[PDB]
Design a protein around this ligand. Structure first.
Ligand code: HEM
Ligand code: HEM
Ligand code: E2Z
Ligand code: E2Z
Ligand code: H4B
Ligand code: H4B
Ligand code: ZN
Lengths: 405, 405
């Protein structure tokens, strides 16, 4: 057969080959000796120019002007700029393409069917932390759009030689506080203890609830971060209830509408955008299973199961399985009622199978991380479970980056 | 570098150093990860000799006599036998140790806490299909044990340069027939259509139920395969009911007690055993979720859901998730009622974490395949979801091999 990974779908019996992987220039963590595919983190002039060149070619290819005068002129322009400044700058429509291409390239995102329909806010003029705040507020208002959510990303200035970075300290634009107690436990979200304690250290007067929205710690170059409270009206939340278990509302659970990742680095043609928050809309298991039920997050599974009156003293009653299902139903139902966009794991994964089909035709494959694409309840009930996937790093890219503290 | 392996629920950290002992490539490279592929693409005197020496070293070291008379003397026997014949033979105790270590090394098996408790039947003195069937019926009898199941492996004669293999054509010892209908559909288990047809073409008179136990096709070397019907009393089945849903039993569903894999190759010290069926006991999700609910298997989700009276018209009612839970519950209830050994996915994964811990102390690691260890429902509800895992191949090993036709 072809000298390319063969990829099989075990439900349908169908076969493809991934030719796209040939274009990866960046090693992941696996070797022939051992697979490290389940780990979460995978821890200069000539280097830059070759990455810049690569990207500019991708751009010209995407507008069908590869080999052209305009193309060879853009390349010259970029070697000359690097020649005398050590860096270069992207045209506007280049950044729009890079950003969409980084999303499209993200192996862990199941929402990629929407990749072409992404609003890109250029914020590369931003010169202060106050100005970040405004740009961020504007993003939240656009993206939230009173519950009818819209994909977006706001791109702050790139890293620059010698000068410090623009950074958002928060991992999301909207996260709930985590308060370490005298008895060792935690009130709120245990995932957020450190950022909470940093916000206090920097002068935030802390609340004491389970669902206190955190302030933003925003940092402009070579400056201490500054603290900004989001105005409550901008932060859409949804109270949780259940369609038939009338008591479920009594639990006082709630989640926010807008999932916005704010500590990832966006890399395009070697340029590094250290602050570039993006947002989409939730898939229901992000909230109902991971956020609410992880042992190390809100961990509410026993609580709900006791209210449902299940036998929590024995694994084989499947009490965890039942309660998680009903928590997920409540998330779905409560967002529908409140007219806030959300997608269930069945719909989401169907749409991702379609994306895979599209990309197979458009590019000869799709980098995908199986363990993240498959949801954390009802795995094999979704079609992605039965699809082999090939995982690799393409550029443009979103990458993790070390916390700034 | 030895990889760092984090558990994300507890914050703990290990380093796998056991992977340094892998002598066998898997499918990944640093350019792309193929960890989600089910099969390898794939489907010498100095070499056999060094694999042999290594295995013998493992054995003598296992029983603590590394260096003794008997150790050096046994290495020479092996050297003398390969030099003269191109092969060698294992002593029975060596075989017992190799089979146990093959199970222990299997990265996809969640049952490995049990690895030391394995009954090994030595069937290397077997010269016909007839004899294989007798050995098979004794394996089934022992392993079944009137429902008090017990781990077992029966080992038929090794592969030999001169000649065809001993093979069990069936992929498991007990399996339900899949009969293709003129109008494309399938009565019984669609996974077994092909082997159902081969049984018919080598003589078997077929039935017409959804749960017809298949005969075995057993092949002695260079001979047409031969057909043997299992005595119905050797094959213990469990009818399926639900603890509270009265109608569930009248669906007619059932399943067999003994999960016995009959098509994998067992490799020890470079020697290869093409027929070496093994069995343990079921993890309930193997039956409730995959066997009964996969779209390409019995595919009963819709049926159950309508009986439960759920809204099938939309995914966001989570009817599939609800039905799947009740089916897995029926399976555990029904096996508990019939006094047949079963383990649920919660108890199983808990015991696998314990096993990881024993193996970190004993060997400095444990090869595991995260996509296989994490169950098909309620993934993140189980501790293995949160646990990073390193996958690699150690010998002795179970391997896949071609269907012999
Ligand atoms: C449009 C709706 C979207 C949906 C439903 C969606 C869904 C998801 C989901 C379920 C994950 C898994 C992350 C987790 O559970 O922790 C994910 C990861 C990701 N998504 Fe999206 N996404 C969407 C939009 C976007 C957009 C607009 C971007 C970028 C512009 C994006 C980039 C990513 C990236 C980079 C990851 C990986 C994050 C990580 O590794 O921690 N997604 N997405
Ligand atoms: C004693 C109870 C046992 C349990 C609960 C158990 C459980 C499992 C499970 C859940 C899997 C994944 C299989 C699937 O559904 O696809 C598996 C795979 C496997 N188990 Fe076990 N197992 C047991 C005993 C054994 C024994 C005795 C052996 C060998 C002698 C063994 C060897 C394997 C191997 C080689 C695989 C990989 C099969 C493949 O790749 O298709 N297991 N086991
Ligand atoms: F504790 C950790 C250390 C490193 C990475 C990690 C995973 C973070 N994953 C972010 C998931 C996330 C959150 C909000 N919003 C999105 N999102 C938005 C659009 N597409 C995805 N994704 C955890
Ligand atoms: F269609 C396929 C092509 C290649 C591999 C495949 C997976 C089969 N995997 C074994 C499943 C299985 C069945 C019964 N019993 C066990 N078993 C017994 C002890 N441990 C596991 N395992 C399917
Ligand atoms: C250890 C394992 O890699 C880790 O727990 C992964 C598994 N799959 C995931 N999948 C998604 N979508 N998000 C995650 O955070 C994780 N966590
Ligand atoms: C494509 C994917 O690798 C395949 O469906 C795997 C996923 N994980 C699995 N895990 C187990 N335990 N058994 C399986 O058959 C599978 N199938
Ligand atoms: Zn890999």
């Amino acid at each position: 057969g072809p000298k390319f990974p063969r990829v099989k779908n075990w439900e349908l019996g169908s076969i493809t080959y991934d030719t796209l992987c040939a274009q990866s220039q960046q090693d992941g963590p696996c070797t022939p000796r051992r697979c490290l595919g389940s780990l979460v983190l995978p821890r200069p002039a000539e280097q830059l120019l070759s990455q810049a060149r690569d990207f500019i070619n991708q751009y010209y290819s995407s507008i069908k002007r590869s080999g052209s005068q305009a193309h060879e002129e853009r390349l010259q322009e970029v070697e000359a700029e690097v020649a005398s400044t050590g860096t270069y700058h992207l045209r506007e429509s280049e950044l729009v393409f890079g950003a969409k291409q980084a999303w499209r390239n993200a192996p862990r995102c199941v929402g990629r069917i929407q990749w072409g329909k992404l609003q890109v806010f250029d914020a590369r003029d931003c010169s202060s932390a106050q100005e970040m705040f405004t740009y961020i507020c504007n993003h939240i208002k656009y993206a939230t759009n009173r519950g009818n959510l819209r994909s977006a990303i706001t791109v702050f200035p790139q890293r620059a030689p010698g000068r410090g970075d623009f950074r958002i300290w928060n991992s999301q634009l909207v996260r709930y506080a985590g308060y370490r107690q005298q008895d060792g436990s935690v009130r709120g979200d245990p995932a957020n203890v450190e950022i909470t304690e940093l916000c206090i250290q920097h002068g935030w007067t802390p609340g004491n609830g389970r669902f206190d929205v955190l302030p933003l710690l925003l940092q402009a170059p070579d400056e201490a971060p500054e603290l900004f409270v989001l105005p409550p009206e901008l932060v859409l939340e949804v109270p949780l209830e259940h369609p038939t278990l009338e008591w479920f509302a009594a639990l006082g659970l709630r989640w926010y509408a807008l999932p916005a990742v704010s500590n990832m680095l966006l890399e395009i043609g070697g340029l590094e955008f250290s602050a570039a928050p993006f947002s989409g809309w939730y898939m229901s298991t992000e909230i109902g299973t991971r956020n609410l039920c992880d042992p190390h997050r809100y961990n509410i599974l026993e609580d709900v199961a006791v209210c449902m009156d299940l036998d929590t003293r024995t694994t084989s009653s499947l009490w965890k399985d039942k309660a998680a299902v009903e928590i997920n139903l409540a998330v779905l139902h409560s967002f529908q009622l409140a007219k806030v966009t959300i997608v269930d794991h069945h719909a989401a994964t169907v749409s991702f199978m379609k994306h895979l089909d599209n990309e197979q035709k458009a590019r000869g494959g799709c980098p995908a991380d199986w363990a993240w694409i498959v949801p954390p309840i009802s795995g094999s009930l979704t079609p992605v479970f039965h699809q082999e996937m090939v995982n690799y790093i393409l550029s443009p890219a979103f990458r993790y980056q070390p916390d700034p503290w």
